[PDB]
Amino acid sequence: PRQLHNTHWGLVCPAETPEGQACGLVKNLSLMSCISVGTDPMPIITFLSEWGMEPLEDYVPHQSPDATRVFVNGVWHGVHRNPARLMETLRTLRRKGDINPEVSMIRDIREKELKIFTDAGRVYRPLFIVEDDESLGHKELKVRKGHIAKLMATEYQDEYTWSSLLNEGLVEYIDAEEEESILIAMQPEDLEPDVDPAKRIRVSHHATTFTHCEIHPSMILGVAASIIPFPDHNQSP
Amino acid sequence: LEPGHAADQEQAKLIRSAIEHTTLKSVTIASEIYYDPDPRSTVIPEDEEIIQLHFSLQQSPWLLRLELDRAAMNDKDLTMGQVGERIKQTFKNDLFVIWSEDNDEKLIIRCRVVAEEDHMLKKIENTMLENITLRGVENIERVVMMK
Amino acid sequence: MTTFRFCRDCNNMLYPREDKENNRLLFECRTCSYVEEAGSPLVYRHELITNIGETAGVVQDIGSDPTLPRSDRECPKCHSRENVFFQSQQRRKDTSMVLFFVCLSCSHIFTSDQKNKRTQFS
Amino acid sequence: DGPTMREITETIAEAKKKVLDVTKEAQANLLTAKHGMTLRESFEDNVVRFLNEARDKAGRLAEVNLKDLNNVKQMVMAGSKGSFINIAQMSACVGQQSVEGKRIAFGFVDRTLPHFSKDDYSPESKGFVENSYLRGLTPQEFFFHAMGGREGLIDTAVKTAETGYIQR
Amino acid sequence: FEDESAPITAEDSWAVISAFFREKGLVSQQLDSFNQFVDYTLQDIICEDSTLIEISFGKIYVTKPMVNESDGVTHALYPQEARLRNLTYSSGLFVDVKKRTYEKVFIGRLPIMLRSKNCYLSEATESDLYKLKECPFDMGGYFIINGSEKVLIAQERSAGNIVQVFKKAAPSPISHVAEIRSALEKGSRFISTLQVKLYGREGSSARTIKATLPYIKQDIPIVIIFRALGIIPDGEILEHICYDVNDWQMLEMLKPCVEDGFVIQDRETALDFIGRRGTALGIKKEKRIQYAKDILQKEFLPHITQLEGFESRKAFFLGYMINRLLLCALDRKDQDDRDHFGKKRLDLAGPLLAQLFKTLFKKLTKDIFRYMQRTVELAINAKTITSGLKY
């Protein structure tokens, strides 16, 4: 427990923990972390059977092995052949607003399982959605200069808000569980397909599969570390 | 090592494999049980040359076949005869054991109990793979050489 | 590889039995009185050095998995270069680091183990 | 020195080539494990040696370059605060992070962070911090180093709690 | 003129972040949790067990923060005053009882989290706040009790309703365990733990698999459970566990399981088997078989269903656990990581304040049912809740 687990990324500050006996056990949420407040799973379950989910009662393994298992809040509700379309529809419904943004949906392609969570207590963060709906080239972030323009245009009048971004499917909330099934780009510039001998060295992008992008890496910190100047130049302890 | 042979990569290895505990499990690739009724002919083709050679200078119809691995067999300085005669001196007359010679391309060990002619064997396999010691001392697993 | 059979009537597991006269292998049921000859003489198998499980996960959608790395090698079948690869799906400390590839065109699995010894990888 | 930095960066790049060759060797199954040792253990053993070897040699290059005027080098010569490892990490490469004697573990499934691809056994993937303190760590190098660091804070609390009892 | 469909740059990120913090602030965690409690959770706790053997509770109302005065009218309470006068920043907790003869009402007090929907400051402008002697920089995700500001620290705990297989210590007779802690969101949280253990270590005479049912003083071989569920044929049982007819290795691990439940060949014999391991020697079969049916329908995997017609749902889930267990035992998977934050949950004001309110609503419920059993011919201890929370 006291160890800084890999999954703590972006959810809990990697620096702020009390020294001594509470070291590692007492933690601090990073700046953009949030917790699931809990949502009713009835509708999703309904939509699932409406979209081809076979009831467990009428399930026969030796008759459909490739079938994907569908779980909701830990309950195995059924099976589904071709989970690709369900997963697509499910993501669209959430990026639209039909499915509460707080809900986590994880498809385990290799494990043949599709898990959904609507319960409370899950720590999540918002990421930049990365798709290829744009024809002009490769994969790009859904947000653009136009979007940010409105944002500030609203920041100046003190209406485009954070929820706007969510409603328009530009940003998503991701808990540690769903985090398992994606690939995140660190800098928004890691999408673009003789360096300054002063800058820090970085590893070249060997992926054209990005599903999301970090809004900003400094948000892995909590309120306290968030006040340290050039923390990336200090010895960890 | 002894005062004289302390600078021999070989005198060490010899002593290594002689101390490092070794069980059949570390040598066996897979153990199988067959219904091979005729102690002469065999449903298993590859096992004909081994029984044919056992008529030169009681038994249950059930067979326990072990397919050893040459890599470990020689890496731990072990001979088929050694392995076999050890298993033999472990189960007494209670078990009938025969094995393929070191020359053959496949190292096989076939055993027969000598009606519950099934459960015993599935236990015999267990005892062989783990309880029987082929070479080495008890409690000594890893054994590394250094200079 | 001991694919065992169940009863034709009650679907309960069948057990091996010896025909003490014609010396052959049978499989009866302990519920009813069903019985039958055996397909093979192999009644038990124990693999100490196992391979099965290293392929688990290869599905018709394995390519749509964004977390997997992609190489541009050539598959012995369609020669295409749309590859996705992963290490052994087993979870043994004594596992190798051999890579398994999956052609995204014909879904053919090919390994990089220069000491290749298996025919189907299944 | 600007030239020293070019010698340091190349020293590190050289190490990343060695690791890359052992990986190919391991992925081809040409690499053989020493007696009483796993294939993966020999592999890890070699990558960590390559990387520490790299940090160390890259460190010397930084030290040799500093003049007798360099105050850091001065405190070290007098024996009042500072040592090699210090110059080496501040000026040149920080080094390989570790937790429980191994490189950072695959805490997510087959990956150290959601930002990497599955089955990536490279040095950047499992905690090698190429950068120095002067240059600044990348967000991944930062988190990895914080995992290494945390282990120290905890071990210190234990070392502090346990020794106190032994002393009595 | 700056095509609105142009890519974004690193600097453009802070714009997006400012938007985030403009909408949520820095303690949305406190507000959102507590707000869900007051708005939904609360009303959902009054309806559960809202009937006594009649009196049925209905709608709930939540007053603004007020004070219990001595020698005076009830007063509207403001934070700056609760801190100073050492008062408690709480609010009314009314209900809506329905007294029906079957052979508004003020109840308790709820302390309010500053800046929650129910708090005055929530709407206060920058100016209104100044007049109220409250700093406009105050974030407000806490409570005021007896004059001191109290914060509820997030309590971390493992998630519930998640299957987890774990290896074990060499000495123990059990080598692997598949665990899950089932619990319900509404009504109550009966955390009855189910354990699917794999007896015997690598290399023992017939490794068997047994499950741990609540109130049953003995582990029951899995095959028997499947039959108490109506799945009798070995073929069908194994089919609910192993979803691959060619997986001779897994099926081989279940062989000793089949032999372990060979004696029982029907649902009744199965139920009676289970019934006895949880009943005295003098109880009649009918009562035994009944006992077992209730245990499997209420204390066995309750997160799935607790109604009647759902034995196939629990059978497949039990098989799924067995499947996961062996999967680890066959070395095809590693034992689950108990440190994965994805399977962790943090309990905040709302959830925490719910366990208490539930526990108190049931104590208040007992104080009302007693005003009926002892009654032969409003008698509600409101403080049962007020000081229960405050405390």
Ligand SMILES: [Zn+2]
């Ligand atoms: Zn039958």
Ligand SMILES: [Zn+2]
């Ligand atoms: Zn191909």
